[PDB]
Structure 1
């Protein structure tokens, strides 16, 4: 039987739940009878990614929409869906493509998680909790609730919840200090770049088995670069609620996980509208999408030499922007060093 601290044990049970993966799949209206969890393929997902990029290129230069309809039917044949008696959405426009690309990101992560769960070795004497914990190849420690780390993290959550995101409020249940096997060596080349910031990354619970195993990754090459507002990079927020929205929490499942990462942003390429790129212009290290609302720079503090923008929301002074809140994008996985993992209770305002 396991000796892990009991918060870490609940975390492991949460990350490796197959039923949550099946529920995520049912929430995308995927047909679980024709295409169950065990018949999820990495290469099938990549082929779906290629269909999305074919729709992107077709729409972009005046192809038949005959063509685009055929590609949408091919997509629904490659990934079987259960829509009952409604008509499935058509892949004819940019929003359809973006929805399916986010969906495929989560599908790929689910495949990674199930591949982890059913792989490696199994040892009947050992607690499954211990087996999965060491499958994560991460050091997970509980952060003391009265530390100053915890002070700053609670203040970061408390101060940067946007008013637009009025469907819920957040309660911090546990704060974990994580260390990914190998990540600090990979991050070393970027640890004295200027402008390193502690930023949020939310994702579904089922995805953290992937995120803790392999880190935060960039979409595969088959993924359409126009399926993401600022192209194929790793996306962070400085508003806790903007990232928390990407946990895809629900009333039926109100606990989520969110990441705090040291991001070496360096020279930020400032953008107010979508720009589907895979590389930065020479001399830039990150993209910053400017919101009309920013955390107050007055109130930034430092934690292990990293800036924390835990100020309250004020106007940026940016006028012709299409973003309500900031976004930070990096295009090299080495530019990220994950520091903390947070268990959040979503209290839905009903």
Structure 2
């Protein structure tokens, strides 16, 4: 029998489920049958990113014919997909290229997860307890009556964007997060600390909790990252929640809240994959949104500003303009993971 709080038991059971990872990869068209997740290697993933660079080259030159077909076929050979009887689809847009980056990120997190979930041959501990220990990340459930639950609930609801109307979110459980080493590494000296959202797919949480949020590797396509290879956050819960890729079938997702040491922001109206080079002493990039929470409503929680909603106009308009802010830091030492929300997505099929 498990010695964990039942809330933690259910969380661990959810994120450490290998079959759920398999099903998630199958939904993304990855061929789990022919290329078992247990046998996938970091070298194979790295080569996958390299083949995306060649696709990126085609996209940035608007070459959509045989050169693109060949580049996509190379990627599909390295990272097996299951397209049934259909001609393999081409990867033609920045959006489609981003989906493939997301796949490789998920594969890397699953590679980590499969190693982590291995249990001891003989042990006095329940499997759930071994998985939990192997995270090296404390997860302490908070009561729904608590002040922290009240404020985080308010943050979640008040920053659900009105343009993200396809679903609502219900907070099922809330955990305080303390990742081994993060406090010691954190730039607690930097000003402008904010409590910001980060969403990710369900397959990714074992990786994120055990290794923290990470930046993209040098081999990844540069233009797959609209503000460069950093760690991306939102001040709108639903902007991050969209990156959970929850569905009617799998409607439980997680959202992470982290204390982010932004320091001096470099404010940008337009996307620039080379943004990190423009910092010139500044500590973070802020993609400037049309709509944002306003300072009048902000509260503090454990030394971080909480940008409570609702969102309203920022006076920012362009070319393209971001709907909502996004914040990018380029070193994990500017992040301290703080809360993990177990969220039920309630989908509305609107027409």
Fold conserved between structures, TM > 0.5:
yes
Deviations along 1:184-204, whole A, 9 cap, x unmatched?
A: 0010xx213111100000111
2:171 is matched with which residue? 172
1:285 is matched with which residue? 283
1:324 is matched with which residue? 323
Show the 5 A alignment for 1:85-104: 85-104=85-104
Instruction: Provide the secondary structure at the position in 2 that maps to 1:107.
Output: helix
Residues 137 and 279 of structure 1, relative CA distance in 2, 3 Å threshold: farther
By how many angstroms is 1:54 displaced?
2.7
Show the 5 A alignment for 1:292-311: 292-311=290-309
Query: Could you tell me how far apart the structure 1 residues matched to 2:55 and 2:82 are?
Result: 22
2:202 is matched with which residue? 205
Query: Could you tell me how far apart the structure 2 residues matched to 1:314 and 1:264 are?
Result: 24
2:267 is matched with which residue? 270
2:216 is matched with which residue? 219
Residues 142 and 95 of structure 1, relative CA distance in 2, 3 Å threshold: closer
Residues 71 and 159 of structure 1, relative CA distance in 2, 3 Å threshold: same
By how many angstroms is 1:313 displaced?
1.4
The count of corresponding residues between Structure 1 and Structure 2 is 347
2:77 is matched with which residue? 77
Output the TM-score relative to the length of structure 1.
0.94
By how many angstroms is 1:93 displaced?
4.1
Q: Tell me, which stretches of 5 or more residues in structure 1 are unaligned?
A: none
Query: Could you tell me how far apart the structure 2 residues matched to 1:279 and 1:183 are?
Result: 26
Deviations along 1:273-330, whole A, 9 cap, x unmatched?
A: 2211254422110111111111122101111221100121111111115211111111
Instruction: Provide the secondary structure at the position in 1 that maps to 2:103.
Output: helix
Show the 5 A alignment for 1:57-136: 57=57, 59-60=59-60, 66-118=66-118, 121-136=120-135
Deviations along 1:154-204, whole A, 9 cap, x unmatched?
A: 1101101111111110110111001001110010xx213111100000111
Show the 5 A alignment for 1:138-149: 138-149=137-148
1:195 is matched with which residue? 192
Contact preservation (8 Å) 1:173, 1:343: yes
Query: Could you tell me how far apart the structure 2 residues matched to 1:25 and 1:179 are?
Result: 29
Show the 5 A alignment for 1:229-244: 229-244=226-241
Query: Could you tell me how far apart the structure 2 residues matched to 1:249 and 1:59 are?
Result: 28
By how many angstroms is 1:335 displaced?
0.5
Instruction: Provide the secondary structure at the position in 2 that maps to 1:311.
Output: coil
2:157 is matched with which residue? 158
Which segment is superposed worse, 50-59 or 312-321? 50-59
Contact preservation (8 Å) 1:279, 1:331: no
Output the TM-score relative to the length of structure 2.
0.94
Which segment is superposed worse, 221-230 or 270-279? 270-279
Instruction: Provide the secondary structure at the position in 2 that maps to 1:83.
Output: coil
- 1:7 matched to 2:17: no
- 1:24 matched to 2:24: yes
By how many angstroms is 1:334 displaced?
0.6
Instruction: Provide the secondary structure at the position in 1 that maps to 2:292.
Output: strand
Contact preservation (8 Å) 2:176, 2:338: yes
The CA RMSD measured in Å over matched residues stands at 1.8
